[PDB]
Each structure stands twice: as structure tokens, then as C-alpha cells.
């Protein structure tokens, strides 16, 4: 019947109690799974939220058990990392005509960007010409914008890759997709494989290839799964690589900006730095050079979450200011400013939040007086301002800007990174009562700009900010168990996540979930055979423009009622979250 093909890949909803014996659950990609540790995230207080997320984050470093998924520390992964270092090196030895591309959509593209800069700094620092570039879905503007719609075109990925790959002779394309999901990346990998004289593709993500997306890509003939399966075959001859450890599910189901983004840095910085230090030593990269770096990153989780109580506090003050319709500001210097801005933007699509609700600033790029004159005026008793810097920063810029803000608001808080035995100028010190200071041991660093110190701090800040922004919103009751029910459908992945969530929370059939979703999307238009047969992009484009789509679909199912009825029931309830919560009961 119409819509049969569009929806063929969808698994049937399991009967009550057999979620598993169906094999529905064994098919849920790890990156889409519910994390058992957070099944009551919607009840944890600030302190537990920090603990549960710090624990989810810990799973990146957890080793493989004995019939189960390879992980970061597994020998198959580390060995692939070695052989990939190997190949970066070949390009490091012939810079002329050589290029290294790091590419993803959304947070994967964001991660790509940071790391491209870093490794270009390192090559510059040695007086060599920078060989790194990034690519992000929607172009460069996406790096600091919520633009969830642009990951959906394979042609567009291939375009940008063709652009940047100019008249280069040797090109390493590291396609980064956490879910092994983004059509943007799928197209690049496939293009690399049709020209391995020039291209070497390395696919990075955190699902088994058996769980990679297998739904049709609208501008492309093969699926992500097929693309990845073919890369895996080429790996035996070292012409493609698939680097895909399991890190376990996200604490907020499907929120791959968290662990997936963190693991992406951890994995690739490790690997790239190894390749660099070892080319200079004229020695092959080895599992042992990778491990040193991996273990430093693992200390970095420990170090970072040593400050949990102060993390939970800042969480409370972020959450308060948002429950009172105030705003939260994130002010930080160099690369940590950038990470600040990434976190705030991501709250827009992740939580349905205003750009002003949690916003980031670099000293978006608003310098000292500029920020003092324009942003500083608009503050308020209930707002929160957050300062994020190292002690190698312009601490005279810092204390000034804090001085002004202190009058306009008292809920200030800071996150400061020091090597041991650096001290905080006593003015600054007096301005913060419980400060989140994170002090790092000394480590022997090979290069000019201490790139290993940079990676530790960026990562630790990411964890802190992610855990804060995410927990702030959970506290406001806006998450259901460990799902964001009320998301904006802005791409095909998110369409599938909505449909899966409808099956999960209603328990009702596939066909009914699909119908209720399309009805809620296209209302006031009824279901026609055209709509049923439409490509998924048509549904996304209409759904993107609307509110409460998923809650309305779910009410419809729960009350076995029409869209008209569900909408009017929603409007006659204190809140979305109450309407849904009470219908589920
Ligand atoms: O397009 S799919 O091949 N893959 C997506 C996916 C794969 C890899 C990374 C992210 C997302 C997906 C597959 C999938 C299977 C079970 C439950 C949720 C699911 O989400 C797909 C496969 C099966 C699906 C489904 C979608 O829609 C939701 C309901 C379950 O049936
Ligand atoms: O890396 P993927 O699986 O291809 O995901 C790419 C993007 O959808 C993803 O990063 C999204 O922007 C984030 O909001 C997920 O929290």
C-alpha cells in the first residue's frame, strides 16, 4: 500500500513484556538506546544528575567484557588507530599535494573544526604548512549555529569535499558520524572509495556497522550501512578504515553531542598527536604511544568530576535563572570561549530553548569593551554569568569584566584551569566564593603550544558545560525518563527518533504510530496517499516549522482520539509535561 517502502525498514512494535524477545531492542542502535543508569534522570536532584552523567561519561573508558562490542581500549580498535596514524604519517612526509579532512554534521562538525585548528597550530609551530581542514554540514556558519536540517544531503557532502580537495594528490577524509548516520558523511566516504588513488576514507563513529543507518538517503542510492560495510571490506587492504568503538548509550537518549562528541575528540586527538610525535621521532606509532594519551584523557574525567559538588551548584543556579525566565551567559577565552558557544547553541535544538537562554561568548566573538558596552547593560538579579578561563589567560581582562557584572548580578561562578602551583590573583579570588578550579598535574610535553594540555582542558570544560546545560533542563521537568519527547523534527534521524519514541511510550503498533505522527505533522491536512508516499524530507520540512508535534501525536494515540481532540486537551492542561505525564498515567 502507499507509504510501504518509505517505512519498510521500521521494526514492528513489540507486545507488552516482550521488548527484547521481539529483537526490537537488539536492533536499537547503541547511540539511540536508553541508558539504564538514567532511567530516572527525570527524578535525580542536581547532585545525582552530575553523578549519573559523570558515570555515563565514564563508560567511554570501560573495557570490553567477555561475545560483545569492541570498545576504545579493545585491541581491534587500538590497532586500527595505529594503522590510521601510519597513514596520516605518509601524508605528513609528503605535504605537497596532501590534505587531511575532518568532517561531520552538527556536533561532529563542531569537533572537526576545533581539532583541525589545533593540529594546524602544531604544524605551524614547527614551521610547516598547515595540512588540516574541516568540513561541516551547511558550511562554516554551522560551526556556531543550530542548523540540524543540513546533515541530510549526500550530494552536498560530496560537493564540499570536492571543493576543498582541489588539485591535491593525497587526501585523508575522516568522516565523523556518531550514529554512523549522517548522509553528508555517507556521501564523502563513498566518493573517497570511488577514487582511492587520491582518497583514503576513515569513518569514525560509535555504533557497530550492523547498526549503521539503513534507510534510503534521498539523494543517494546506497545506505550508510552499505557504505560502511564496503569500507570495512577495504580495510583488509588498508584502503579504508572504520573506527567505531562502542561507548554505551547517552545519558539523555540520542544526545550524541555529549559522549559522542567527547569520544570523538578523545579518539582523534590521541591518534593524530601520536602520529605527529612519532613522525618527528622517526618511529612508527604504536599501541603504546596511543595508550599514554588515552590514559591522560581518562585521568581528565576523574579530575574533572572530582569537582562534582561545585558542578551541581552551578547547575542549580543555571536552572533557577531559567525557571524564572532569566538568561544564562557563558564567557570564556580562546578555545574555551568557542566550546562555550557550542554548548549554548546546542541547547536550542536539544531542549527547544531560546538562543538567549544559554549563550556563549569568546573574548558571538565580542571583545572586552564591546561586551561591556552592549551585553553588560541587559543583565539582572536572576541571571547567571559563568567565567571560563585558564590562568595563562589575560587575567586583567577577566577581573575587569567580572567586576562590572558583579554589580548587575551576584550569581557569578567560574571555571578555572591551572597547572599545580599557579595562583589566583587575590582580587579575582575574592570575587568567587566556591570557585570550580581544576588543577592539572605537570606532564612532559613535546611541542611548543602544549597541545596535550589544551585537549585536556577543552574536554574537561565540554564535560562540565554539557553536564550543566543538560542537567539544568532536566531539573525543569522537560525530559521524560531519559528521553527528550518534545523535540523539533528537523532531520530524518530525528523523525525516526520521534517514531521510535511513539512506539516506546504508547506501546501501539507501527502503522498507528506512523499515522498519528504524519497526522500531527501535516494537520490540518488529512492523510492522502501522496503524504503517505512522500519522501521523509517532506515530513521534516513541515514538522520543523511546528510546536508540540510529538506530544500531540502521542496524546492522539494514548486517548485514541483525533488531532483536534489532542490539541484541545493539550491547550487545556497546565503544561505539555503535565499533559503527557498524566496521559501516560
Ligand atoms: O533509519 S534506520 O535504519 N536507523 C536508525 C538509526 C541508526 C543508526 C544511528 C541512528 C539512527 C534507527 C534504527 C532503529 C531501530 C530500532 C529503534 C530505533 C532506531 O533508530 C531505522 C530502522 C528501524 C526503525 C527506524 C529507523 O525508525 C524508528 C523505529 C524503529 O524502526
Ligand atoms: O554525529 P552524528 O551521529 O552524524 O550526529 C550529528 C548531529 O545530528 C548531532 O551531532 C546533533 O547535531 C546533536 O544535536 C546530537 O546531540
From Swiss-Prot:
Residues binding beta-D-fructose 6-phosphate are: 107-108, 177-179, 493
Q: Which InterPro entries match?
A: GKRP_SIS_2, Glucokinase_regulatory_CS, MURQ/GCKR, SIS_dom, SIS_dom_sf
* Start and end residues of each stretch annotated as Important for interaction with GCK: 197-198
Keyword list, A-Z = Carbohydrate metabolism, Cytoplasm, Mitochondrion, Nucleus, Repeat
Q: Which GO CC terms are listed, alphabetically?
A: cytoplasm; cytosol; mitochondrion; nucleoplasm
GO molecular function of the protein, one example? glucose sensor activity
Q: Which residues form the SIS domain?
A: 88-284, 318-478
Q: Does the keyword Repeat apply?
A: yes
Enumerate the PROSITE patterns for this protein: GCKR, SIS
Which family does the record claim for this protein?
Answer: Belongs to the GCKR family.
Query: What is recorded about the protein's domains?
Result: Fructose 1-phosphate and fructose 6-phosphate compete for the same binding site.
Q: What does this protein do?
A: Regulates glucokinase (GCK) by forming an inactive complex with this enzyme. Acts by promoting GCK recruitment to the nucleus, possibly to provide a reserve of GCK that can be quickly released in the cytoplasm after a meal. The affinity of GCKR for GCK is modulated by fructose metabolites: GCKR with bound fructose 6-phosphate has increased affinity for GCK, while GCKR with bound fructose 1-phosphate has strongly decreased affinity for GCK and does not inhibit GCK activity.
Subunit record text: Interacts (fructose 6-phosphate bound form) with GCK.
Q: What is this protein called?
A: Glucokinase regulatory protein
